[PDB]
């Protein structure tokens, strides 16, 4: 409440928050520690009330940042986009709300999207989102941008205010029953009901008119009008290739009602098995416990979103916008992986800072059986691929695991939609087609399970052995993020939960790369493509259905997926559309290789090299009084991990997007 204590005097102190940074700038390690501990509000000077203040205000500031980003997206759609051309004819014109300058010949990046527009094709599905929302006018998009900017300002003001409104007595953030009830009834229930209302009152008429072909201003400014009795999802909009928006609105109304009912039964105490969860309720009333749980929840929801946004079509024309659906799936899968490893990290932090649950007292059997299942899964799943490779090379296809040869049928992969026979098409494209599972799907799914289990093994080992282990018994005293305990006892490198995350991130990236490749190749070979004429169509797929024949071997993956489908990105230099993607492919390769420097080398070599270099500076009287230092061990690991993941993700990003853009245009 007292705002006289907020002054810019501390802005120039640069390290006031951390007491360990009091002896300001004796080395560059001080700068690095400042950055590393900037947002670690728990270990910073102050009190628990201040920690809560910072957490909540930072959440609000990030909310404002996201609102600013959304407002920028809306502004770009309104003023720097071909949304008008896309709306009138989505198929011919690729979405593009992105324009580049003509600085150094950089105008080559802009590619033909419409007669009067040239730019970069966007892959976020924002045009389809606008169409679903009923936004069909520049004025509507402009007012959406204005609302987003106003929300940004409001959130910024809220953060600034709450930095002082909340005092040491503040306890509203500890009212978990009130928090959960409010979020469940208002944020989710009422939110879903209100969005169903919005759909019914605005989007349904506009979308129906757009499907018909009407573009009249008076009409733009009778539910279930066109939807038959067919089950939702069993019949897609013939003119749009997506679930009926009236069905979506009914879904949101039902979901809001269900959430309100759940909240009300919780309010009335109808739920009875409180004791089964009371232990968790007492244990996990912590910042890091809640952060870990929420991160895992949102990771799983992001993965489900990645799957459903493609398998179940709900946005107009997103089904046929192949780059959009692919990019959405890949982006949300990557976010799922990142937030899962985050949940592991903050579980470890909670274990370090608070008392763990009693399942940590038989941790040896848990991790031992997880190790065994990881080993067995990896052996069988990957050795089937290796067996296929070796036997096929020897010239014995009859001995390999494939549909024609020994076949591993996925008996448990059974249908549940009960769809009618055939496929759904929309203007020379396959909006929806059943995925037929065989030996290749069996093998790839078990590879997925293996990688998921190994990542889980790393995270769980880090969590359970955070406090102590047979090797070192004072890991709790060591803390959360330390490089080692020493060269002793054989060597205690990377025994910390921080390093366990540092490895689990590598494994999550490996898992997600395999998942991305599986989705990409399977969709290209067996789902996406065009058709050539009760009528029967012969479907010409982009990859020509080679997944089921070539995916059974690692050589097939290397040749038919990486080498064969890298033709677009590798040969993209002359092409105006994707030359940027080719350059980013090259640069991401460079960055990934550059990460190996930090991942393989060690601190001492660089410190000694720095001292030898500094000899010459001292000789010439160039004396830096912030004495240069080699990056700490943990920082070197972090830098290597960041560059490695960024380079790999960039290579995959450019490769897939170039392929999709060229194929669809």
């Amino acid at each position: 409440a007292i705002f006289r204590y907020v002054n810019a005097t501390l802005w120039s102190k640069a390290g006031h928050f951390n007491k360990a940074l009091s002896k300001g700038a004796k080395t560059t390690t001080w700068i690095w520690n400042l950055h590393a501990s900037a947002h670690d509000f728990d270990i910073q000077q102050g009190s628990a009330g201040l920690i809560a203040r910072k957490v909540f205000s930072s959440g609000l500031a990030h909310l404002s940042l996201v609102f600013f980003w959304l407002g920028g997206m809306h502004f770009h759609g309104a003023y720097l986009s071909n949304y008008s051309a896309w709306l009138k004819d989505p198929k011919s014109v690729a979405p593009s709300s992105h324009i580049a300058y003509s600085l150094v010949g950089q105008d080559i990046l802009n590619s033909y999207t419409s007669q009067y527009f040239s730019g970069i094709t966007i892959t976020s599905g924002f045009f389809q989102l606008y169409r679903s929302e009923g936004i069909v006018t520049q004025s509507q998009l402009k007012y959406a941008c204005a609302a987003s900017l106003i929300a940004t300002l409001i959130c910024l003001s809220g953060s600034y205010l709450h930095m002082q409104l909340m005092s040491k007595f503040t306890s509203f953030y500890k009212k978990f029953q009130s928090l959960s009830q409010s979020h469940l009834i208002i944020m989710f229930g009422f939110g879903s009901v209100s969005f169903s209302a919005h759909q019914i009152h605005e989007a349904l008429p506009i979308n129906s008119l757009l499907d018909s072909g009407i573009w009249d201003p008076q009409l733009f400014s009778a539910i279930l009008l066109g939807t038959p009795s067919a089950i939702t999802g069993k019949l897609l909009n013939p003119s749009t290739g997506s679930i009926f928006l009236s069905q979506v609105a009914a879904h949101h109304l039902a979901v809001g009602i269900v959430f309100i009912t759940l909240g009300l039964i919780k309010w009335c105490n109808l739920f009875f098995s409180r004791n089964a969860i009371l232990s968790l309720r007492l244990a996990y009333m912590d910042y890091h416990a809640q952060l870990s749980i929420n991160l895992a929840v949102w990771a799983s929801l992001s993965m489900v979103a990645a799957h459903h946004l493609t398998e179940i079509p709900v946005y107009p024309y997103e089904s046929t916008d192949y780059p959009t659906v692919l990019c959405l799936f890949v982006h949300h899968a990557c976010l799922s992986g990142f937030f899962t490893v985050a949940s592991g990290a903050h579980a470890s932090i909670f274990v370090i800072r608070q008392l763990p649950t009693s399942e940590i007292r038989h941790r040896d059997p848990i991790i031992g059986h997880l190790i065994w299942v990881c080993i067995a899964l990896g052996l069988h799943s990957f050795g089937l691929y290796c067996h296929n490779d070796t036997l096929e090379a020897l010239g014995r296809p009859e001995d390999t695991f494939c549909d024609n040869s020994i076949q591993l049928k996925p008996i448990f992969a059974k249908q549940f939609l009960g769809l009618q026979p055939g496929i759904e098409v929309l203007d020379g494209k396959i909006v929806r087609m059943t995925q037929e599972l065989g030996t290749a799907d069996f093998m790839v799914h078990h590879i997925h399970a293996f990688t998921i289990h190994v990542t889980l093994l790393i995270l769980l080992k880090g969590v359970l052995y955070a406090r102590n282990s047979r090797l070192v018994s004072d890991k709790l005293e060591l803390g959360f993020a330390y490089p080692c305990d020493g060269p002793g006892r054989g060597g205690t490198c990377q025994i910390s939960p921080w390093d366990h995350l540092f490895l689990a991130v590598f494994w999550m990236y490996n898992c997600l790369s395999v998942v991305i490749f599986h989705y990409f190749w399977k969709m290209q070979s067996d789902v996406w493509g065009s058709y050539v004429h009760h009528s029967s169509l012969t479907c010409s797929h982009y990859s020509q259905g080679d997944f089921s024949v070539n995916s059974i071997t690692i050589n097939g993956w290397l040749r038919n997926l990486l080498w064969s489908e890298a033709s677009q990105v590798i040969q993209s230099y002359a092409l105006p559309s994707i030359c940027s993607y080719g350059f980013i492919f090259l640069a991401a390769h460079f960055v990934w290789a550059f990460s190996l420097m930090f991942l393989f080398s060690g601190r001492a070599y660089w410190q000694e090299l720095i001292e030898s270099i500094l000899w010459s500076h001292h000789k010439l009287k160039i004396v830096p009084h912030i004495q240069p230092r080699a990056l700490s061990i943990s920082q070197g690991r972090a830098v290597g991990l960041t560059h490695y993941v960024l380079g790999g993700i960039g290579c995959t990003w450019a490769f897939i997007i170039s392929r999709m853009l060229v194929l669809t245009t």
């Binding site: 047979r470 305990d485 020493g486 002793g488 006892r489 054989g490």
Partner: protein, 86 residues
């Protein structure tokens, strides 16, 4: 086992002894420094080689040195728990 040696640069601040995880070191009377004590390493057989003494040593270069000897590894220096060589 490892070799833990102490040099006369020692000032007897006891930080090595306090940082010892398996109590290998102990302060002993001396006249070399003003503190009138120098760390010793009688129980070097228990030294694991963590170099926490070395980390805690203040002197410009360490007055206590732990030389690792991987060829002479014992169960005490390896911190063996599940297996017993005794």
């Amino acid at each position: 086992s490892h070799a833990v040696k102490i040099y006369d640069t020692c000032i007897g601040c006891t930080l090595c002894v306090r940082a010892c995880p398996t109590d290998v070191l102990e302060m002993v009377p001396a006249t070399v420094n003003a503190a009138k004590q120098v760390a010793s390493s009688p129980r070097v057989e228990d030294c694991v080689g963590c170099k926490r003494c070395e980390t805690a040593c203040p002197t410009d270069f360490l007055s206590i040195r732990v030389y690792l000897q991987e060829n002479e590894e014992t169960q005490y220096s390896l911190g063996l728990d599940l297996a017993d060589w005794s």
